[PDB]
Amino acid sequence: AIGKVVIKETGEGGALLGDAVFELKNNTDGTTVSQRTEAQTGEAIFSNIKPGTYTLTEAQPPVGYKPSTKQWTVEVEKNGRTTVQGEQVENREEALSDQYPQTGTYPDVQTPYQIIKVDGSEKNGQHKALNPNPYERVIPEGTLSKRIYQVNNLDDNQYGIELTVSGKTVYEQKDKSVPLDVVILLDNSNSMSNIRNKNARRAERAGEATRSLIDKITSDSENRVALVTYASTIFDGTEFTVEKGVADKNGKRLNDSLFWNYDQTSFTTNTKDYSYLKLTNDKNDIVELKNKVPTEAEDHDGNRLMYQFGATFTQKALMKADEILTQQARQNSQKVIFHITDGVPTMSYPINFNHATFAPSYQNQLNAFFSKSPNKDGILLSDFITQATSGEHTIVRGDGQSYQMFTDKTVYEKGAPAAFPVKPEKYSEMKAAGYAVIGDPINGGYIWLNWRESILAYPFNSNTAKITNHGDPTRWYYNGNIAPDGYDVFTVGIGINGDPGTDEATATSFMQSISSKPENYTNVTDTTKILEQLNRYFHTIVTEKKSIENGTITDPMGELIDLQLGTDGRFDPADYTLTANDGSRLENGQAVGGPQNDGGLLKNAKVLYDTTEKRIRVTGLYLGTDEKVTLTYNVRLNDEFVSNKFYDTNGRTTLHPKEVEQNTVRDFPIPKIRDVRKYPEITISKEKKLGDIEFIKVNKNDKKPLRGAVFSLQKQHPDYPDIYGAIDQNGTYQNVRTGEDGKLTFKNLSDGKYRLFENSEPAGYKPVQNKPIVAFQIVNGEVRDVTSIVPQDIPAGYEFTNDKHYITNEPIPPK
Numbered sequence: 001a002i003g004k005v006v007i008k009e010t011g012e013g014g015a016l017l018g019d020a021v022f023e024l025k026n027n028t029d030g031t032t033v034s035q036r037t038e039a040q041t042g043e044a045i046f047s048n049i050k051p052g053t054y055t056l057t058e059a060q061p062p063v064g065y066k067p068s069t070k071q072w073t074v075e076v077e078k079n080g081r082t083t084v085q086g087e088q089v090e091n092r093e094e095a096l097s098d099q100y101p102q103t104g105t106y107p108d109v110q111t112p113y114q115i116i117k118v119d120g121s122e123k124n125g126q127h128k129a130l131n132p133n134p135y136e137r138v139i140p141e142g143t144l145s146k147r148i149y150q151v152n153n154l155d156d157n158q159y160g161i162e163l164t165v166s167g168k169t170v171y172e173q174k175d176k177s178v179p180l181d182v183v184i185l186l187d188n189s190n191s192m193s194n195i196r197n198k199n200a201r202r203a204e205r206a207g208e209a210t211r212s213l214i215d216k217i218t219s220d221s222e223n224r225v226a227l228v229t230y231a232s233t234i235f236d237g238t239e240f241t242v243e244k245g246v247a248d249k250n251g252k253r254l255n256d257s258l259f260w261n262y263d264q265t266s267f268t269t270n271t272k273d274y275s276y277l278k279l280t281n282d283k284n285d286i287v288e289l290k291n292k293v294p295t296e297a298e299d300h301d302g303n304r305l306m307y308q309f310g311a312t313f314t315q316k317a318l319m320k321a322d323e324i325l326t327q328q329a330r331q332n333s334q335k336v337i338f339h340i341t342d343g344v345p346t347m348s349y350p351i352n353f354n355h356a357t358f359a360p361s362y363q364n365q366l367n368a369f370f371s372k373s374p375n376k377d378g379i380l381l382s383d384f385i386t387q388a389t390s391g392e393h394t395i396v397r398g399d400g401q402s403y404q405m406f407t408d409k410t411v412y413e414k415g416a417p418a419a420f421p422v423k424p425e426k427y428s429e430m431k432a433a434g435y436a437v438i439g440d441p442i443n444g445g446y447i448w449l450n451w452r453e454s455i456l457a458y459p460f461n462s463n464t465a466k467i468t469n470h471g472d473p474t475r476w477y478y479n480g481n482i483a484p485d486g487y488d489v490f491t492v493g494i495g496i497n498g499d500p501g502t503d504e505a506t507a508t509s510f511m512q513s514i515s516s517k518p519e520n521y522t523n524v525t526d527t528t529k530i531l532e533q534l535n536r537y538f539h540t541i542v543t544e545k546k547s548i549e550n551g552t553i554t555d556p557m558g559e560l561i562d563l564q565l566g567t568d569g570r571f572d573p574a575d576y577t578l579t580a581n582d583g584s585r586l587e588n589g590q591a592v593g594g595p596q597n598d599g600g601l602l603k604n605a606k607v608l609y610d611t612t613e614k615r616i617r618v619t620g621l622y623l624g625t626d627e628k629v630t631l632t633y634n635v636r637l638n639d640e641f642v643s644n645k646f647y648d649t650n651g652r653t654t655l656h657p658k659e660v661e662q663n664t665v666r667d668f669p670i671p672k673i674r675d676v677r678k679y680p681e682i683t684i685s686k687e688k689k690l691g692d693i694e695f696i697k698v699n700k701n702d703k704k705p706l707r708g709a710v711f712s713l714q715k716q717h718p719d720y721p722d723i724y725g726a727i728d729q730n731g732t733y734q735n736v737r738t739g740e741d742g743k744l745t746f747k748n749l750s751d752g753k754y755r756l757f758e759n760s761e762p763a764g765y766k767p768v769q770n771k772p773i774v775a776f777q778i779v780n781g782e783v784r785d786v787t788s789i790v791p792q793d794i795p796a797g798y799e800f801t802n803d804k805h806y807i808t809n810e811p812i813p814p815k
């Protein structure tokens with residue numbers, strides 16, 4: 001139903017000829033179809049020719065032209081390939097059909113995918129190739145993809161094919177049915193400022209590490225995360241007040257900073273909102289939470305208001321993590337805190353000592369507090385003051401000055417008690433405001449400085465127990481209210497050395513005591529290794545497994561699709577590429593490169609080609625999240641294609657993510673290519689036909705043939721009408737003398753008007769001396785209008801009898 005052959009006829013030098021008539025007959029059934037050279041195009045076209053062998057014959061030629069003595073053989077193959085046997089022809093461009101399949105179906109789970117036209121495959125308004133869309137498929141193990149990624153040679157049906165595979169990293173808890181509920185506590189104190197610490201980039205690196213840890217925790221959709229950012233308070237967007245400054249010896253407060261007036265003893269503002277105080281596993285919420293992670297801290301000194309909020313109130317942060325897990329964690333979940341900090345506490349909530357007259361000794365009081373804690377080693381939250389109607393700043397201990405709570409109220413400078421200078425012009429004002437000014441209005445004076453009450457040890461005059469640093473209460477807080485809960489608590493310190501107010505050994509002991517075991521604190525000195533350390537602690541509670549583990553791609557070529565092996569006809573490294581996104585590659589069959597220069601992701605990958613099965617396999621794939629391999633190779637549509645028909649480039653194309661699981665198979669989507677077969681066009685050069693006509697000279701009476709008559713054939717002159725002359729100047733058909741058969745035979749005669757003259761009768765016949773006998777015309781090489789022109793009474797005649805032209809002579813009668 002798909003064979004085709006076209007015949008053109010030329011003539012006059014080479015102009016195109018109309019009206020020819022052809023026949024195509026099937027040599028096994030005898031069936032016939034006939035076709036006529038069409039009017040405008042000058043072509044005779046046979047369409048829709050079925051497989052088999054044919055004879056093609058010219059039934060009639062155009063008017064004017066000789067018939068053809070030639071019969072052509074026409075074989076149509078099972079695929080519609082039309083050949084005219086042992087004959088030179090032009091093969092002509094054929095138009096592509098407008099039929100396209102619209103979908104493929106994934107065998108594995110039986111779902112449709114769309115199919116679209118490939119750019120660069122357009123040929124005259126139609127397309128030769130189709131890609132799946134999308135060409136990349138999401139799978140539980142990552143993604144896979146297959147497409148034509150380039151057209152190498154459109155006219156020759158040559159394309160480049162690309163397959164990719166990307167993996168997934170899976171974290172599994174020691175108990176699968178127990179997901180994680182995680183709070184991250186993140187220090188945003190001023191010391192985290194990126195330019196501080198010799199440009200250590202603390203904030204940005206701890207922030208980038210936090211974001212990456214969130215990605216790892218939440219890659220399992222069951223796990224939930226929350227984020228607490230802290231410094232002098234929880235950074236949550238709410239309005240907050242801090243106090244600053246020192247005091248004179250009667251306790252009248254004053255800010256000795258040169259950035260502020262002496263009466264600026266408190267600061268109020270909204271903090272930045274760097275917290276996400278809700279455990280969540282919703283993807284949109286997680287996006288929002290990671291955007292709240294700070295990558296800066298306050299860069300300026302104390303001339304900025306926000307600097308006043310950037311000390312280290314560790315207890316309050318630990319409190320917020322315990323609150324979130326207590327209030328929001330699931331019953332059956334592993335509860336975790338990751339705490340990233342760069343300093344020891346410099347603020348804490350006061351232990352609620354009783355100062356009434358008959359109250360027990362401070363040590364007795366404290367021992368009773370320890371006695372209520374679960375492990376007899378800490379203080380319950382209800383035995384601290386953590387709220388006040390006048391505000392937190394009125395009860396909190398410390399302000400960022402030191403880990404110590406000073407046991408001497410005196411501020412020292414240069415080896416001696418320090419005084420605030422009061423110039424003569426401020427003497428009256430500071431004296432009237434109620435400060436203990438020493439000096440006078442002429443010379444000015446000074447105000448001896450003391451640390452304010454809330455920065456000192458308390459109870460300050462105790463003869464028994466006395467709290468002298470912010471670590472002890474924070475640690476007792478932890479032991480009393482966090483340790484009995486069974487949380488995993490990991491602490492990553494950044495450059496911790498005990499500044500301000502203590503040393504590296506106390507700082508280390510303290511950070512260990514607010515982690516769930518001492519190994520669960522690590523101090524990082526290189527800020528580029530914060531993520532590595534968070535990751536290490538992550539890996540004590542999960543095991544990591546890659547989803548593609550000695551995976552295999554199996555990629556059979558489609559029916560009538562040939563893998564390009566180039567001239568050697570052998571599959572070798574010139575015929576494919578295999579690269580991966582760690583920069584590794586197969587090079588001459590060997591895996592090279594990657595950041596460790598060991599072949600990286602491709603270290604164990606092989607590309608094989610089974611020549612019997614026409615199939616590529618890629619073995620040895622090991623891929624986690626963001627690990628991706630690419631295979632490319634070239635194919636060509638086989639010469640035996642069926643015209644217009646789309647061929648899949650591959651058979652069933654599969655990824656087995658794990659050789660360990662032989663029945664887990666994922667399908668790749670499949671491209672298609674086609675071509676339209678050219679048809680044979682025979683051009684026939686036709687010969688103009690020329691006229692012929694024969695007369696028999698005979699006796700009038702008995703119609704016997706006569707020898708010895710002489711005739712001349714005249715032709716009308718092309719210019720003048722009344723004027724017949726010789727045909728050429730050689731001697732052609734001039735004085736032709738008849739033989740015993742009587743025949744006058746004319747052939748190869750051009751078109752036009754002719755007059756046959758009898759020059760002389762034969763011996764024994766009435767004289768006929770140069771007389772016109774017959775007129776006729778040759779038109780389109782045929783004899784027309786054969787008429788007698790014998791003059792009246794001349795004894796010659798013309799007769800037409802039993803299909804023959806006769807010229808008669810009358811014998812001389814008896815004397």
Ligand SMILES: [Ca+2]
Nearest residue numbers: 322481482485
């Ligand atoms: Ca608790």
Ligand SMILES: [Ca+2]
Nearest residue numbers: 565566570572
């Ligand atoms: Ca090769």
Ligand SMILES: [Mg+2]
Nearest residue numbers: 189191342343
């Ligand atoms: Mg700090």
